[PDB]
Amino acid sequence: AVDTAEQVYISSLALLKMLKHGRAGVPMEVMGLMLGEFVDDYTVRVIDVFAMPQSGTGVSVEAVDPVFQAKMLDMLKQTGRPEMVVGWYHSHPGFGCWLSGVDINTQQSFEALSERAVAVVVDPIQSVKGKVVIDAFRLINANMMVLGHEPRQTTSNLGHLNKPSIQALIHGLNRHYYSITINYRKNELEQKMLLNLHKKSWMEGLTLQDYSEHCKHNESVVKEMLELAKNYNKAVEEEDKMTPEQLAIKNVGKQDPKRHLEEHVDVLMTSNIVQCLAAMLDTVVFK
Amino acid sequence: MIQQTEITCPKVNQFRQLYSKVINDKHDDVMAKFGAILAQGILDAGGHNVTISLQSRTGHTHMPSVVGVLVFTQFWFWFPLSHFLSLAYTPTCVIGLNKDLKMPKVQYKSNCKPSTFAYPAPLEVPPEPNFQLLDNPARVMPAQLKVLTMPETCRYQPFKPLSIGGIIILKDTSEDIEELVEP
Amino acid sequence: DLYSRYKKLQQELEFLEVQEEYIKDEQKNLKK
Amino acid sequence: LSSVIQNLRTDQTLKMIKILSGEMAIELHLQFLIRNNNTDLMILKNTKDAVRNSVCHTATVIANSFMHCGTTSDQFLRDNLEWLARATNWAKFTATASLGVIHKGHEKEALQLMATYLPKDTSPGSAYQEGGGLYALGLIHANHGGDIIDYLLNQLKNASNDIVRHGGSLGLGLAAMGTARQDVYDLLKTNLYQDDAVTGEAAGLALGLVMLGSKNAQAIEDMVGYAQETQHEKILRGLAVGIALVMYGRMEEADALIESLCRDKDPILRRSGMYTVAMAYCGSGNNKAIRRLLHVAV
Amino acid sequence: MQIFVKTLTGKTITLEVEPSDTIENVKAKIQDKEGIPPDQQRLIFAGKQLEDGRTLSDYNIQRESTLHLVLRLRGG
Ligand SMILES: [Zn+2]
The string over B12-28, giving b where at least 16 C-beta atoms fall within 10 Å of a residue's C-beta and e elsewhere, is eeeebeebbebbeeeee
Residue closest to D152 by CA, chosen among D198, D192, D123, D111: D111
Q: What angle do CA D133, D139, D142 make, to 5 degrees?
A: 135
In sequence order, the β-bridge partners of residue A36 are A84
Q: How far is A116 from chain E (nearest CA, A)?
A: 11
Q: Cβ distance D164 to D130 under 8 Å?
A: yes
A159 burial (CB, 10 Å; 0-12 / 13-18 / 19+) is: middle
User: What's the N-to-C CA distance of chain D in angstroms?
Assistant: 42
Distance CA D103, CA D116 (A): 15
The string over E33-53, giving b where at least 16 C-beta atoms fall within 10 Å of a residue's C-beta and e elsewhere, is eeebeeebbbbbbeeeebeee
CA distances from E17 to E1, E13, E55, E65, E70 (A): 6, 12, 12, 12, 19
- HSE at residue B116, side-chain half, CA atoms within 13 A, is 11
Cβ-based interface (< 8 Å): residues of E facing A:
7-11, 34-36, 40, 42, 44, 47-49, 68-76
* A contact chains, 3+ CB pairs < 8 A: B, D, E
**Dihedral over Cα of E18, E19, E20, E25: its sign:** positive
Residue closest to B96 by CA, chosen among B168, B162, B171, B172: B168
User: Which residue among B67, B95, B138 sits closest to D28, beta carbon to beta carbon?
Assistant: B95
- Provide, as residue numbers in chain A, all residues whose Cβ is less than 8 Å from the Cβ of B31: 156, 159
DSSP H/E element including C7: helix C4-31
Q: How far is D55 from chain A (nearest CA, A)?
A: 7
Distance CA D131, CA D100 (A): 12
Distance CA A82, CA A72 (A): 11
| Count of beta carbons in the 10 Å neighbourhood of residue D147 | 9
User: Which residue among A59, A65, A109 sits closest to E71, beta carbon to beta carbon?
Assistant: A109
| Experimental determination approach used | cryo-EM
3+ Cβ–Cβ pairs closer than 8 Å linking A and C: no
Q: Is C20 on the interface with D (CB under 8 A)?
A: no
Cβ-based interface (< 8 Å): residues of A facing B:
153-157, 159
DSSP H/E element including E24: helix E23-33
* Cα torsion through A258, A260, A266, A267, rounded to 10: -170
Q: Check residue E21 and report its DSSP letter.
A: -
The contacts of residue B116 (CB under 8 Å, 6+ apart) are: B128, B129, B130, B132
Crossing angle of helices D127-140 and D91-102, rounded to 10°: 20
- What are the DSSP calls for B64-119, one per residue? HHHHHHHTGGGTTT-GGGGGGGGGGEEE-B-----SSS------BEE--SS---SS
In sequence order, the β-bridge partners of residue A8 are A44, A182
- At A169, the amino acid letter reads L
Q: Cβ distance B148 to B137 under 8 Å?
A: no
Q: Can you say how many angstroms the Cα of residue B60 is from the centroid of all Cα atoms in its chain?
A: 20
| Count of beta carbons in the 10 Å neighbourhood of residue B126 | 4
* CATH number of the structural domain spanning residue E8: 3.10.20.90
The torsion angles phi and psi of E44, rounded to 5 degrees, stand at -120, 130
Distance CA B122, CA B135 (A): 21
DSSP H/E element including A34: strand A31-38
In sequence order, the β-bridge partners of residue B110 are B148
Distance CA D98, CA D73 (A): 12
Residues 143-182 of D with CB under 8 A from C: none
The contacts of residue B38 (CB under 8 Å, 6+ apart) are: B82, D59, D62, D63, D66
The contacts of residue D47 (CB under 8 Å, 6+ apart) are: B23, B37, B40, D60, D63
Residue closest to A11 by CA, chosen among A33, A31, A36: A36
Q: Cβ distance E36 to A112 under 8 Å?
A: yes
- Provide, as residue numbers in chain B, all residues whose Cβ is less than 8 Å from the Cβ of D25: 167
* D contact chains, 3+ CB pairs < 8 A: A, B, C
| Count of beta carbons in the 10 Å neighbourhood of residue D73 | 17
How many domains would you assign to chain E? 1
Residue closest to B46 by CA, chosen among D25, D93, D63, D175: D63
The contacts of residue A181 (CB under 8 Å, 6+ apart) are: A6, A7, A8, A158, A161, A162
Range of the domain at E48: 1-76
Distance CA A103, CA E73 (A): 9
Q: Cβ distance B47 to D39 under 8 Å?
A: yes
The contacts of residue D158 (CB under 8 Å, 6+ apart) are: none
In sequence order, the β-bridge partners of residue A136 are A120, A180
| Count of beta carbons in the 10 Å neighbourhood of residue D153 | 17
CA distances from A272 to A215, A260, A279 (A): 9, 19, 11
Interface contact A157-B77, CB threshold 8 A: yes
- At A160, the amino acid letter reads H
What 3 state SS string does chain D have? CCCHHHHHCCCHHHHHHHHHHCCHHHHHHHHHHHHCCCCCHHHHHHHHCCCCCCCCHHHHHCHHHHHCCCCCCCCHHHHCHHHHCCCCCCHHHHHHHHHHHHCCCCCCHHHHHCCCCCCCCCCCCCHHHHHHHHHHHHHHCCCCCCHHHHHHHHHHCCCCCCCHHHHHHHHHHHHCCCCCCHHHHHHHHHHHCCCCCCCHHHHHHHHHHHCCCCCCCCHHHHHHHHCCCCCCCHHHHHHHHHHHHCCCCCCCCCHHHHHHHHHCCCHHHHHHHHHHHHHCCCCCCCHHHHHHHHHHHC
- Provide, as residue numbers in chain B, all residues whose Cβ is less than 8 Å from the Cβ of D32: 49, 91, 93, 95, 137
Residue closest to A11 by CA, chosen among A194, A160, A145, A180: A194
Q: Cβ distance B27 to D51 under 8 Å?
A: no
Distance CA A154, CA A10 (A): 23
Q: Cβ distance E76 to A58 under 8 Å?
A: no
A91 burial (CB, 10 Å; 0-12 / 13-18 / 19+) is: buried
Residue closest to D75 by CA, chosen among D86, D85, D89, D61: D61
Give Dmax (Cα) for chain B: 68
User: What's the N-to-C CA distance of chain C in angstroms?
Assistant: 48
The torsion angles phi and psi of A235, rounded to 5 degrees, stand at -60, -55
Residue closest to D75 by CA, chosen among D109, D111, D37: D37
A201 burial (CB, 10 Å; 0-12 / 13-18 / 19+) is: exposed
Q: Cβ distance D280 to D261 under 8 Å?
A: no
Rg (C-alpha) for chain E, rounded Å, is 12
Q: Cβ distance D279 to D245 under 8 Å?
A: yes
**Dihedral over Cα of D148, D152, D153, D155: its sign:** positive
* Cα torsion through E40, A140, A184, D224, rounded to 10: -120
Distance CA E18, CA E26 (A): 10
Q: Cβ distance B82 to B70 under 8 Å?
A: no
Contacts by D19-22, CB closer than 8 A, 24 or more apart:
D19/B100, D22/D144
Distance CA B120, CA E38 (A): 73
Q: Is B149 left (phi over 0), alpha (psi -120 to 50) or beta?
A: beta
Q: Check residue B122 and report its DSSP letter.
A: P
Distance CA D253, CA D257 (A): 8
CA distances from A201 to A189, A191, A204, A211 (A): 19, 18, 6, 21
Residue closest to A34 by CA, chosen among A14, A9, A16, A7: A14
DSSP H/E element including A184: strand A177-184
- Provide, as residue numbers in chain A, all residues whose Cβ is less than 8 Å from the Cβ of E9: 84-85, 113-115
Distance CA A76, CA D91 (A): 45
CB pairs under 8 A between A and B: 18
- Provide, as residue numbers in chain A, all residues whose Cβ is less than 8 Å from the Cβ of D195: none
